[PDB]
């Protein structure tokens, strides 16, 4: 038997996880909720969820204070954007098992967070910030200026949530929780995207949703940064919020706050980025004693820039400070364009690189007094592998691979999670074999035990004909470009398979990796006998700037051409039926799919774009201007005009096209597909469409998810003459 | 050979390869009319024509001329340009006036840009126009205009123009101005939309528009706050440039001010007598008021003794609204279409003073419209001929002897002509006859004194010459007995039609209250292609709820939309198969508007009869559609009226049954009439029960999906869908 559409849709074959929250340097929680001792693996029950038997409300999430004296309960969850939401809250006392009733956290709270030490609490209600020193006492109102859709204290607006921070919160406690650092966003002049929301059938008149949303070249939100001392809050007088202004080099024009990182109890570092995102500045600000302000000396500014592109992968990387805070490490691209760990002195311009080579550091995971722990794709020169390394701080040549040889056949893609002081770590392996979860001791790196091996799943999959994955590379202009293929079971090299190109191809993307996945591709390969391939061409990430910056100021050119060239290279692989080649993608993949189908190349018979960008002036400023610069006569308007899918409408006469878009998509506005269809209508091209009423960019509803995949499978089977 | 080998193709339909010529004129006097080439005057009597306006005169103009309007006294011409469409009838435009006798454009005191409506008085050259929701009057074209109203406010106050609902469902027109017969008085309506909710939808516009626009229209959905209405009359002879003009209000009768009502008809009776018709929001009760000007007062009075009640116990009043009266010259009597004691619409003769009228026509047929009345004769269109409800002929009844009825069109050309409409001269001395089928449209001119034909205007013989070689479909018009009642249907049958083989069949559906899809009209449309090229029988059926056959049939779906008319379409299909020449594995259904609603209701009915269907811009649930139309048939969506059936008749609740059929759902995003919402809500329901289906939106298209490129695209898309559902290569 085979892995079927139903299997994928009704999630028949499950991937077991082992998610843990470190609580201390030797303990973690595991949802009843258990507490585990990392040393021995023994566990006691923390609370039965029959403790809230009579609670009366459906509990969404829990959150334990650092000191473990109180638990925060979250209910009435109402999802907003990708990260943002609203909820009700309650505080349960562990010391004396019962809830708090006096001075509760209001309904419709936008964000809550314990300080990093003890049980202090900061929350956001109606765009304003409040602080509770004790869970049962009244809160002090920090900000008074919050206003819906206009002023944002402690939480991000639409574009910051999605493109800058990947988070709704804009609150940063200092390490011991004395200081609360926050940002304030101002959206007064940011234009609003409006779209219909149809809601339940019983709603007679549709609702109009309005969201401040800066499209490429529009007026952006403005940002201010503040620090407040939470150990001197008066119930008599208003809390005083000290402002930290952006450096002079940023106040000269539009700019972003892109990073907040505390260094010590009294030292904070902020990163700022120009609107033309190729110049950024790191401020280190120290707290002044009697005077009570924050100073950011000019001689302590650290400039990060790029002549060939934008700075960072999506944003400048984050610093990891030493204990005294007089030094830090952060990832930057070296002189040959590869991203490696640089070591800075707070007082000095030059850093020394502590890693080198033709491969990249993915991130810094933990920093100790003796070692620095990082993840990279160095192992076997494979851009799509991921391994944990240890680097000796007094001798940089002493680098140990901690995950490389643990199970080299089944494990090539690792992420990690260290305990409070990096005493223990959990390795998470995501492929090529079934995911593997292991617990380790950093004092010597020996493995304590397996936490989850997925043997349950492995026994079930023994019964089904499963596809395989080929990960390899092709040479193009003397450079390696990586591809992967999901191959049908009992794959015959002397046979001719229909091929479907799964595309993303956005700047810094990586679609060829060692990760094990059960998705739509799995079914297409297992049941329909279709080869599903992906390709990382120019603009793709984790392989140096030369490749990544190749599309600087030129979205919709080389990365499009490379998908076409990829499909050509596969035709010449012998086992591909080149009368049956298709391409599909979501978001950026949708844009590339569309551009490829509009290319008039002749290679693809049909394709599917889901929620595609259609022209760049339609998408948000932060993401778009990062790669395209500004849509103005003196910058890059010409290429904004030359890279629309609309302009390629005539070429669509050559292919079969299915266009799909959610009508309540706040991210890629329905507008984008509305303009594509009008364009195809105007040149007389027949095509397939489908809208999803009240679905957003995810088309994530249980039923909408099934509908779309079902619809797409029918399109593909019809296009490929499959019954 | 020389055998017919061409067929009527999709491209033929989309590119207008075979075009119907039509002779459109506009009478300017009692014996003269205007016709376009260039613009000619034609003497109706002789045929002699001189050039009235050479095409070259307005090229110095600088602007592209969309339309023209000659003043009643032929001294001035109104030139319309910068036309920008709004709804089905309303638009904005610029206007310039060309003086004929001085032979040049009036430069001083021009009509402002963005004018909403312009209208000459019926005699002379007075002018009335609406700009920014206010009414202005020009006594002379080159002179300053006097402002009549001062209260006009966009989306709130409408003076002399209708709002969305009154435009689409009450008046079928943007204007709400009425000149008295000689231009002395100017009657107008004011609409107040203050508390009317707004429908909001996205307009995406040109691709250079970065942020979509949101369009906001005052639109009362069933049960919502309706617009209120006031009525006024202003004497245009006593206007002065020194004082603001005085407008005399005429208030509705007591029985209307008691609750929500509508102004449904305005008809001047003489120089000093106007008739009003009002309707209650529950549209079964209407009151005609006859109002007279009082000389010494300057005010209007509607005597309660002249008041006329018209009501219905089995449904609503009139076909879509009460009928309009036709007054005798002395405005002391009138003729008006109403239903007789047994549900048949016939001409009633009324005295202004008496309650009772006498019916001057009788029969198991109906009068369609009164077309003209003179001293001795009344002219009307009816479907009496041969007891064919879908036929239309011009008749003549003698006012002093009701048994003296002459058919004027019946026998003219019985074989090709069975569907007529007429256009009379200014005093009914001549008339143009228009025949729409079953043969090729034919256009003829007649004098009504002797009734002789004067000449053929257009005979479509160029078209006839082209069709001679094309394998054209034929139409079969007939009926079936159900519950002892005749129910008519029409079939567009493929060329060389063979009773002994099985054809696939498409049900073409409207089926709304008072609809008629079975008729004698000749059409070159999508169905002609499907029969001719693709060999599909496309059929239509008038079931319960359809019109022009009496109230017994028409009112059968009263307060029960989505029941019998839906059921009768299913039964129609079972009947069609039972005739033996239908492949019942291949039966489909499609419709637009109400037809889309019925299509959907049918496909969700679980009947097992239809394999697939197409719904275009359908109504999905009645609480989404407008008040005037929906309440006419459904009453109010309240617990103490008819909420139950409103809830019982949505397409959404039938989603589960769509698992059995193939469904194509189509909707323009800028549809102001049946909002995108209605399709949006169907699709969501189908997704929720796991039904796959085909969808297509049209960016910025409205209810008509009538852009050239958009029209071509949807018919092509629909054609692919049907061809695949039927296994046609
Ligand atoms: C957010 O920014 C807006 C727009 O820059 C500020 O609005 C201005 O406020 C000043 C002083 O109050 C006025 O003189 C201007 O006329 C305002 N401009 C506009 C267009 O509104 C606003 O002050 C800022 N709000 C906060 C809390 O920082
Ligand atoms: C703390 O600050 C807030 C805002 O500055 C004060 O609340 C405002 O009080 C002023 C008068 O001082 C009023 O004009 C506003 O209407 C108030 N705005 C509100 C309700 O947010 C608050 O009173 C301050 N506390 C004190 C007394 O210093
Ligand atoms: C249109 O109708 C609105 C509301 O139906 C009228 O508004 C009323 O006006 C008076 C004063 O002019 C207020 O005191 C009432 O309270 C208003 N009614 C309500 C309940 O809103 C308005 O007069 C009308 N507009 C015109 C000029 O005809
Ligand atoms: C496929 N894909 C992406 O395209 C992608 C993507 N991430 C991004 N960007 C970073 C997160 N915020 C949005 C941009 N993109 C591009 C994108 C996402 C959603 C809508 C439009 C765009 Cl252009 N991923 C993970 C991803 O998997
Ligand atoms: C097919 N068809 C109609 O459906 C029709 C229709 N006429 C109507 N109504 C009367 C005129 N004004 C609109 C309503 N309908 C029903 C309808 C039309 C347009 C949108 C929605 C509806 Cl429910 N015609 C002529 C007509 O030909
Ligand atoms: C595990 O065992 C140790 C000693 O046996 C004990 O101190 C600890 O509390 C236990 N941990 C849990 C969470 O059960
Ligand atoms: C939140 O809302 C509920 C229901 O409306 C109310 O009963 C409850 O007291 C609210 N919680 C608080 C603490 O405001
Ligand atoms: C944390 O650090 C602050 C600032 O240096 C210091 O004064 C204090 O000892 C700590 N806060 C508390 C009260 O725990
Ligand atoms: C940033 O980009 C702009 C626009 O391409 C360019 O003029 C400038 O040189 C860049 N700055 C740096 C530091 O390279
Ligand atoms: C039309 O023809 C008639 C008949 O000969 C002629 O008298 C007349 O002058 C023509 N039309 C006009 C009024 O110019
Ligand atoms: C209408 O607009 C045009 C173009 O802007 C202008 O030249 C003209 O004067 C306007 N006409 C009137 C009557 O105001
Ligand atoms: C006419 O009415 C308007 C608005 O009520 C007013 O402003 C204007 O002055 C009036 N004209 C005169 C002078 O009577
Ligand atoms: C039009 O009718 C009115 C009222 O009957 C009358 O007083 C007026 O003089 C008429 N106009 C002409 C000159 O025909």
Short mmCIF file of C-alpha atoms in Angstrom, two decimals, chain B residues 314-646:
data_model
loop_
_atom_site.label_atom_id
_atom_site.label_comp_id
_atom_site.label_asym_id
_atom_site.label_seq_id
_atom_site.Cartn_x
_atom_site.Cartn_y
_atom_site.Cartn_z
CA UNK B 314 -52.65 36.14 -3.23
CA UNK B 315 -49.38 38.02 -3.72
CA UNK B 316 -47.84 41.37 -4.59
CA UNK B 317 -49.39 44.20 -6.70
CA UNK B 318 -48.55 44.38 -10.43
CA UNK B 319 -45.94 42.31 -12.28
CA UNK B 320 -42.96 44.12 -10.66
CA UNK B 321 -44.82 47.22 -9.47
CA UNK B 322 -48.28 48.68 -10.04
CA UNK B 323 -49.03 49.50 -13.66
CA UNK B 324 -49.02 53.08 -14.94
CA UNK B 325 -52.26 54.88 -15.95
CA UNK B 326 -52.95 56.30 -19.39
CA UNK B 327 -55.16 59.36 -19.16
CA UNK B 328 -57.66 60.66 -21.68
CA UNK B 329 -56.85 64.13 -23.01
CA UNK B 330 -59.18 65.80 -20.48
CA UNK B 331 -57.55 63.82 -17.61
CA UNK B 332 -61.01 62.78 -16.38
CA UNK B 333 -60.55 59.08 -17.08
CA UNK B 334 -57.79 56.57 -17.46
CA UNK B 335 -56.91 53.11 -18.67
CA UNK B 336 -54.67 50.92 -16.52
CA UNK B 337 -53.63 47.25 -16.50
CA UNK B 338 -54.84 45.28 -13.47
CA UNK B 339 -55.72 41.63 -12.85
CA UNK B 340 -59.34 40.65 -13.32
CA UNK B 341 -61.41 38.62 -10.85
CA UNK B 342 -59.69 35.46 -12.07
CA UNK B 343 -56.01 36.38 -12.05
CA UNK B 344 -55.71 37.72 -15.59
CA UNK B 345 -54.15 41.11 -16.30
CA UNK B 346 -56.45 43.18 -18.50
CA UNK B 347 -57.19 46.82 -19.36
CA UNK B 348 -59.49 48.52 -16.89
CA UNK B 349 -61.32 51.74 -17.67
CA UNK B 350 -61.49 54.15 -14.73
CA UNK B 351 -63.39 57.33 -14.09
CA UNK B 352 -61.39 59.67 -11.86
CA UNK B 353 -64.36 59.89 -9.44
CA UNK B 354 -65.53 56.28 -9.24
CA UNK B 355 -64.04 53.29 -7.35
CA UNK B 356 -65.22 50.59 -9.78
CA UNK B 357 -63.82 50.27 -13.26
CA UNK B 358 -64.99 48.12 -16.15
CA UNK B 359 -62.68 45.68 -17.90
CA UNK B 360 -62.50 46.40 -21.61
CA UNK B 361 -60.52 43.24 -22.37
CA UNK B 362 -61.20 39.68 -21.14
CA UNK B 363 -59.67 36.29 -21.68
CA UNK B 364 -57.37 33.54 -20.55
CA UNK B 365 -54.47 35.60 -21.81
CA UNK B 366 -52.94 38.90 -20.66
CA UNK B 367 -52.30 42.40 -21.91
CA UNK B 368 -48.59 43.17 -21.84
CA UNK B 369 -48.64 46.97 -22.24
CA UNK B 370 -50.83 49.88 -23.31
CA UNK B 371 -48.86 51.46 -26.20
CA UNK B 372 -51.02 54.49 -27.14
CA UNK B 373 -54.48 55.94 -26.83
CA UNK B 374 -56.24 58.47 -29.04
CA UNK B 375 -59.83 59.75 -29.24
CA UNK B 376 -61.30 56.59 -30.83
CA UNK B 377 -58.70 53.90 -30.20
CA UNK B 378 -56.55 52.20 -27.57
CA UNK B 379 -53.44 50.39 -28.76
CA UNK B 380 -52.01 47.52 -26.72
CA UNK B 381 -49.57 44.58 -26.95
CA UNK B 382 -50.87 41.18 -25.77
CA UNK B 383 -50.24 37.42 -26.02
CA UNK B 384 -53.77 36.45 -27.11
CA UNK B 385 -52.88 35.23 -30.60
CA UNK B 386 -53.27 31.43 -30.77
CA UNK B 387 -53.13 31.18 -26.97
CA UNK B 388 -49.33 31.46 -26.99
CA UNK B 389 -48.17 33.24 -23.83
CA UNK B 390 -44.71 33.75 -25.35
CA UNK B 391 -46.06 35.51 -28.45
CA UNK B 392 -46.63 39.28 -28.77
CA UNK B 393 -48.92 41.18 -31.12
CA UNK B 394 -50.20 44.75 -31.52
CA UNK B 395 -53.94 45.18 -31.07
CA UNK B 396 -56.44 47.96 -31.55
CA UNK B 397 -59.63 48.30 -29.46
CA UNK B 398 -62.38 50.78 -30.33
CA UNK B 399 -63.13 53.00 -27.30
CA UNK B 400 -66.83 53.16 -28.02
CA UNK B 401 -67.31 49.47 -28.79
CA UNK B 402 -65.23 46.97 -26.83
CA UNK B 403 -66.26 44.09 -29.11
CA UNK B 404 -64.47 45.93 -31.95
CA UNK B 405 -60.92 44.61 -31.55
CA UNK B 406 -58.53 44.46 -34.50
CA UNK B 407 -55.19 42.69 -34.52
CA UNK B 408 -52.73 44.93 -36.39
CA UNK B 409 -49.72 42.62 -36.51
CA UNK B 410 -51.10 39.07 -36.36
CA UNK B 411 -51.48 38.45 -40.05
CA UNK B 412 -48.70 40.67 -41.46
CA UNK B 413 -46.18 37.84 -41.81
CA UNK B 414 -47.46 34.95 -39.67
CA UNK B 415 -44.66 32.56 -40.52
CA UNK B 416 -41.61 34.60 -39.51
CA UNK B 417 -43.23 37.12 -37.16
CA UNK B 418 -44.83 36.28 -33.78
CA UNK B 419 -43.09 38.67 -31.34
CA UNK B 420 -43.85 42.35 -31.80
CA UNK B 421 -43.18 45.67 -30.13
CA UNK B 422 -44.21 49.07 -31.42
CA UNK B 423 -43.04 52.69 -31.55
CA UNK B 424 -45.76 55.30 -32.21
CA UNK B 425 -45.36 58.80 -33.60
CA UNK B 426 -46.00 61.87 -31.39
CA UNK B 427 -49.79 61.59 -31.79
CA UNK B 428 -49.99 57.95 -32.94
CA UNK B 429 -50.45 58.80 -36.66
CA UNK B 430 -47.62 56.41 -37.60
CA UNK B 431 -45.88 53.50 -35.93
CA UNK B 432 -42.79 51.40 -36.40
CA UNK B 433 -43.29 47.69 -35.93
CA UNK B 434 -40.44 45.55 -34.65
CA UNK B 435 -40.63 41.80 -35.04
CA UNK B 436 -38.09 39.78 -33.02
CA UNK B 437 -38.86 36.29 -34.36
CA UNK B 438 -39.27 33.33 -34.77
CA UNK B 439 -37.73 34.43 -38.10
CA UNK B 440 -35.07 37.09 -38.61
CA UNK B 441 -35.96 40.43 -37.01
CA UNK B 442 -38.04 42.61 -39.32
CA UNK B 443 -38.68 46.38 -39.11
CA UNK B 444 -41.73 48.04 -40.73
CA UNK B 445 -43.43 51.47 -40.86
CA UNK B 446 -47.22 52.04 -40.84
CA UNK B 447 -49.90 54.73 -40.87
CA UNK B 448 -52.54 53.99 -38.25
CA UNK B 449 -55.42 55.73 -40.06
CA UNK B 450 -55.89 52.86 -42.56
CA UNK B 451 -53.30 50.53 -40.99
CA UNK B 452 -51.49 50.03 -44.30
CA UNK B 453 -47.77 49.16 -44.48
CA UNK B 454 -45.76 52.08 -45.82
CA UNK B 455 -42.39 50.33 -46.20
CA UNK B 456 -39.84 47.82 -44.94
CA UNK B 457 -37.21 49.62 -42.85
CA UNK B 458 -34.81 46.69 -42.25
CA UNK B 459 -35.30 43.06 -43.34
CA UNK B 460 -31.95 41.52 -42.30
CA UNK B 461 -31.44 40.05 -45.76
CA UNK B 462 -27.66 40.49 -45.60
CA UNK B 463 -27.78 38.20 -42.52
CA UNK B 464 -30.13 35.83 -44.34
CA UNK B 465 -27.64 35.63 -47.20
CA UNK B 466 -24.87 34.60 -44.77
CA UNK B 467 -26.89 32.06 -42.76
CA UNK B 468 -27.93 30.27 -45.97
CA UNK B 469 -24.87 28.03 -45.75
CA UNK B 470 -24.66 27.61 -41.97
CA UNK B 471 -26.11 24.59 -40.14
CA UNK B 472 -28.40 26.54 -37.84
CA UNK B 473 -30.41 25.22 -34.88
CA UNK B 474 -34.22 25.28 -34.84
CA UNK B 475 -36.51 26.22 -31.97
CA UNK B 476 -39.39 24.06 -30.80
CA UNK B 477 -41.98 25.91 -28.65
CA UNK B 478 -44.55 23.80 -26.82
CA UNK B 479 -46.23 22.86 -23.53
CA UNK B 480 -46.78 19.96 -21.11
CA UNK B 481 -49.81 19.34 -18.87
CA UNK B 482 -49.09 19.13 -15.14
CA UNK B 483 -51.89 19.15 -12.52
CA UNK B 484 -54.16 19.90 -15.52
CA UNK B 485 -52.18 23.10 -16.21
CA UNK B 486 -50.28 23.96 -19.41
CA UNK B 487 -46.58 24.75 -18.81
CA UNK B 488 -44.54 26.05 -21.71
CA UNK B 489 -40.96 25.16 -22.70
CA UNK B 490 -38.61 25.96 -25.59
CA UNK B 491 -35.86 23.86 -27.18
CA UNK B 492 -32.93 25.04 -29.24
CA UNK B 493 -32.43 21.84 -31.25
CA UNK B 494 -29.18 20.87 -33.10
CA UNK B 495 -29.17 20.89 -36.96
CA UNK B 496 -30.59 17.74 -38.64
CA UNK B 497 -32.24 16.92 -35.31
CA UNK B 498 -33.07 13.23 -34.90
CA UNK B 499 -35.85 12.15 -32.49
CA UNK B 500 -34.41 8.60 -32.38
CA UNK B 501 -30.99 9.43 -30.89
CA UNK B 502 -30.01 10.74 -27.45
CA UNK B 503 -28.55 14.24 -27.13
CA UNK B 504 -26.96 15.80 -24.08
CA UNK B 505 -29.18 18.57 -22.65
CA UNK B 506 -28.55 21.91 -20.96
CA UNK B 507 -31.32 23.51 -18.93
CA UNK B 508 -31.12 27.25 -19.41
CA UNK B 509 -32.69 28.79 -16.36
CA UNK B 510 -34.09 32.05 -15.07
CA UNK B 511 -37.33 30.89 -13.34
CA UNK B 512 -37.82 34.06 -11.28
CA UNK B 513 -41.17 35.58 -10.32
CA UNK B 514 -42.83 36.59 -13.61
CA UNK B 515 -40.02 35.21 -15.75
CA UNK B 516 -40.45 33.89 -19.29
CA UNK B 517 -37.74 31.89 -21.05
CA UNK B 518 -40.14 30.16 -23.48
CA UNK B 519 -40.91 32.57 -26.34
CA UNK B 520 -40.92 33.18 -30.10
CA UNK B 521 -37.93 35.58 -30.14
CA UNK B 522 -34.97 34.86 -32.50
CA UNK B 523 -31.53 34.80 -30.76
CA UNK B 524 -27.89 34.56 -31.74
CA UNK B 525 -26.29 33.64 -28.42
CA UNK B 526 -24.25 31.05 -26.49
CA UNK B 527 -27.08 28.50 -26.89
CA UNK B 528 -26.95 28.85 -30.68
CA UNK B 529 -23.30 27.78 -30.62
CA UNK B 530 -23.95 24.84 -28.26
CA UNK B 531 -26.70 23.48 -30.49
CA UNK B 532 -25.10 24.27 -33.88
CA UNK B 533 -21.47 23.41 -33.21
CA UNK B 534 -21.60 21.14 -30.16
CA UNK B 535 -24.91 19.24 -30.71
CA UNK B 536 -26.30 19.98 -27.23
CA UNK B 537 -30.04 20.60 -26.79
CA UNK B 538 -30.49 23.71 -24.73
CA UNK B 539 -33.92 23.94 -23.16
CA UNK B 540 -35.87 26.35 -20.96
CA UNK B 541 -39.03 25.89 -18.91
CA UNK B 542 -41.59 28.28 -17.43
CA UNK B 543 -42.92 26.59 -14.29
CA UNK B 544 -44.77 27.90 -11.28
CA UNK B 545 -43.99 31.53 -10.65
CA UNK B 546 -43.56 32.49 -14.28
CA UNK B 547 -45.41 35.40 -15.90
CA UNK B 548 -47.91 36.46 -18.55
CA UNK B 549 -50.19 33.44 -17.91
CA UNK B 550 -52.14 34.71 -14.89
CA UNK B 551 -51.78 34.92 -11.10
CA UNK B 552 -52.73 31.29 -10.41
CA UNK B 553 -49.31 30.46 -11.91
CA UNK B 554 -47.38 33.67 -11.09
CA UNK B 555 -48.31 33.87 -7.39
CA UNK B 556 -47.77 30.16 -6.71
CA UNK B 557 -44.31 30.93 -5.26
CA UNK B 558 -45.57 33.83 -3.09
CA UNK B 559 -43.60 33.88 0.20
CA UNK B 560 -41.91 30.63 -0.91
CA UNK B 561 -38.94 31.54 -3.09
CA UNK B 562 -36.76 28.49 -3.77
CA UNK B 563 -39.55 25.91 -3.76
CA UNK B 564 -41.93 25.28 -6.66
CA UNK B 565 -39.89 27.08 -9.29
CA UNK B 566 -36.89 24.98 -8.22
CA UNK B 567 -39.02 21.79 -8.17
CA UNK B 568 -40.53 22.52 -11.60
CA UNK B 569 -37.12 22.76 -13.24
CA UNK B 570 -36.25 19.29 -11.89
CA UNK B 571 -39.60 17.97 -13.15
CA UNK B 572 -38.97 19.69 -16.51
CA UNK B 573 -35.77 17.62 -16.91
CA UNK B 574 -37.57 14.37 -15.99
CA UNK B 575 -40.15 15.29 -18.65
CA UNK B 576 -37.50 16.02 -21.25
CA UNK B 577 -35.82 12.64 -20.76
CA UNK B 578 -39.29 11.01 -20.93
CA UNK B 579 -39.58 12.30 -24.50
CA UNK B 580 -36.88 9.78 -25.45
CA UNK B 581 -34.24 11.91 -27.19
CA UNK B 582 -32.21 12.93 -24.15
CA UNK B 583 -29.14 11.15 -22.80
CA UNK B 584 -29.94 11.29 -19.11
CA UNK B 585 -26.37 10.54 -18.08
CA UNK B 586 -25.64 13.97 -19.56
CA UNK B 587 -28.05 16.62 -18.30
CA UNK B 588 -26.83 20.00 -17.05
CA UNK B 589 -28.27 23.27 -15.80
CA UNK B 590 -27.00 26.85 -15.83
CA UNK B 591 -28.25 30.32 -14.96
CA UNK B 592 -27.35 33.94 -14.17
CA UNK B 593 -28.72 36.03 -11.22
CA UNK B 594 -31.99 34.36 -10.14
CA UNK B 595 -31.09 31.61 -12.60
CA UNK B 596 -27.82 31.02 -10.74
CA UNK B 597 -29.75 30.74 -7.47
CA UNK B 598 -32.13 28.18 -9.02
CA UNK B 599 -29.18 26.34 -10.61
CA UNK B 600 -27.53 26.09 -7.19
CA UNK B 601 -30.75 25.11 -5.44
CA UNK B 602 -31.29 22.40 -8.06
CA UNK B 603 -27.73 20.98 -7.78
CA UNK B 604 -28.11 20.93 -3.99
CA UNK B 605 -31.54 19.28 -4.11
CA UNK B 606 -30.17 15.70 -4.22
CA UNK B 607 -32.34 14.85 -7.23
CA UNK B 608 -29.80 12.69 -9.06
CA UNK B 609 -30.93 14.16 -12.40
CA UNK B 610 -28.15 16.68 -13.21
CA UNK B 611 -24.48 15.79 -13.76
CA UNK B 612 -23.18 19.37 -13.57
CA UNK B 613 -24.11 23.01 -13.55
CA UNK B 614 -22.90 26.58 -13.74
CA UNK B 615 -24.06 29.37 -11.46
CA UNK B 616 -23.10 32.88 -12.50
CA UNK B 617 -23.37 35.74 -10.01
CA UNK B 618 -26.01 33.82 -8.02
CA UNK B 619 -28.14 34.83 -5.04
CA UNK B 620 -27.22 32.40 -2.24
CA UNK B 621 -29.38 33.70 0.53
CA UNK B 622 -32.24 36.19 0.33
CA UNK B 623 -31.19 38.25 3.38
CA UNK B 624 -28.20 39.26 1.21
CA UNK B 625 -30.28 40.67 -1.65
CA UNK B 626 -32.02 44.08 -1.82
CA UNK B 627 -35.20 44.93 0.08
CA UNK B 628 -37.51 46.16 -2.70
CA UNK B 629 -37.08 43.01 -4.79
CA UNK B 630 -36.78 40.37 -2.03
CA UNK B 631 -39.61 41.63 0.23
CA UNK B 632 -41.95 41.88 -2.76
CA UNK B 633 -41.99 38.04 -2.68
CA UNK B 634 -40.66 36.98 0.72
CA UNK B 635 -42.09 39.59 3.09
CA UNK B 636 -39.89 40.51 6.05
CA UNK B 637 -37.11 38.30 7.51
CA UNK B 638 -38.56 38.64 11.04
CA UNK B 639 -39.92 35.93 13.41
CA UNK B 640 -43.42 37.41 13.14
CA UNK B 641 -43.38 37.33 9.33
CA UNK B 642 -41.26 34.94 7.24
CA UNK B 643 -37.80 34.50 8.80
CA UNK B 644 -38.36 30.73 8.81
CA UNK B 645 -38.47 30.40 5.02
CA UNK B 646 -35.64 32.91 4.56
#
